[model samples]
Target: DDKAAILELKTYLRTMKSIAVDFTQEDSKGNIVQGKLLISKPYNFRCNYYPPFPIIIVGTKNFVSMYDYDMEQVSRIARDENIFNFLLEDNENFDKDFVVESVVNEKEFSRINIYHKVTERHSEITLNKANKQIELLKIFEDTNVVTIKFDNIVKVQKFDEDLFKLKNPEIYGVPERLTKSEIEKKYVVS
Candidate 1:
């Protein structure tokens, strides 16, 4: 089981430069809902449908923006510890953390389950054989389980440079200052 899953994962990892995965989550009662997540190497991500609004986290030294598509408002957050950790840890090192569980035969393709351990948290990834891509990710942290799925994946040789670059607030008609107090105040209420 472990060997098969590892082999499948290795093959898939080689061909990916960057990948966007769309996912659907089902509650414990089995009600299904959907969302989309885009992930790229060297810190590039966008997830419009995820909770706490759509967010983009850039490099270690710049800004983090959370967009509320419904409100047409974008909140600029100053770089901080959490954001810095994300920028530094979200990379190939993450790939090395996964441990293969098993390979199961699904209807049209095989499903390989991989486990990733971060501290005491564990995330389970399910990869599909047909596209050699991740189909689902079940993240178990504390008392919450968040599952993410990938669908309609489109691969590109190169993505826009802006996706990975930290944007200056002045370029977006926002204040350009490091206001750690504002960030602290906002999170205090959240």
Candidate 2:
């Protein structure tokens, strides 16, 4: 059962195309924040934090942009520096880049820890046992621990254009993107 669970983790990672979900993040210092996370597989992601947080981060395979509303500033950095870059990797690449460190199965979920073979960065991904769905992600770097929990998961084939484009929130206005539930209710397509 344990070995099969490992295969399940690999298969699940290889198959997902896109995901939109609500997330709650807590750092080792106990600071907490809530946000909506949107990902277009293999290269794009946007994380829009709820009001008062004043931060929106967007990234592609090559670059990452963080826009701060309070300062009305947008900062750019190499995408590879973003801890979540692992989620933007293709199947073949992902398979080659990451190796399983351990897998622990519990009554309700399977917890898998993986590390980048070259960079040695580590991530702990928790999957729901019943449906093989991702439930949480914990990224560890030095003494810093960032734990992100996923909820309201929505799998979609694609995301709106410009959703992952770096733009100043104050100047361009926020991009409009819909979740899977909203799309279904509006189009009557299951």
Candidate 3:
């Protein structure tokens, strides 16, 4: 039974490659953020939130980056360490890194829910049955739940390699490195 389910997902992945999505996301604070997401095979993605909130993430299979311009902060984490990234992993190894929580086939769509065994982060993705395009995605991490409603999501056969490269403009000045104390203060104080 389990093998059959994994086979189903693998079949889907075989046909899935590149996707571009315009998203309206509501964060845990109930604040709305608009962003564009571009994903191509081999774990390339650029997800940048439009201004009014300053956050951008550009990643590849090897590394991932986060820039919080509001805080003048930039953090680098391994691709495997980023909970926001499992869905973008090379599909061949997806099941190796995550367990399938459940897969539900709906009337016109299917929803796959999975989680990282170590991070405890969970994500649910719904795909259009007819086209296999992602329709919606939700991620849960700690107290924050991020919901992404996909608009204009379509497959792109090719992508500019630059899209996956991290760019920190010199005008933004140097971003401060993260420290354990600052995290401890905000986390410990509150």
TM-score of each: 0.56, 0.81, 0.74
Off by over 4 Å in 2: 1-3, 78-81, 168-190
Instruction: For candidate 2, write residues 18-82 as lDDT tens digits.
Output: 87767899998877987877777777888877765777788876678987767767788554356
lDDT, model 3, position 31: 85
Best by lDDT: 2
lDDT of each: 0.48, 0.73, 0.66
Model 3 Cα lDDT, one tens digit per residue, 1-190: 3454455556656655676666788878878977667677666777756667677787887778888877777788664445347546666776677788888886878788888776667888776767656677788867887788877655666665665766565565553332223212221110
- lDDT per residue for candidate 1 within 1-190, as digits (tens), equals 3476666656655555465445566544444654544445444554434443333334323444664444555676543212122213433454665455566776655655544444434445567766666666665546556655566665544544444444444466432221223222221110
Order of the predicted models by TM-score, top scorer first: 2, 3, 1
Q: Tell me the RMSD of model 1 versus the true structure.
A: 10.2
Task: Give candidate 1 misplaced runs (Cα > 4 Å).
Answer: 25-36, 50-54, 57-96, 101-113, 168-190
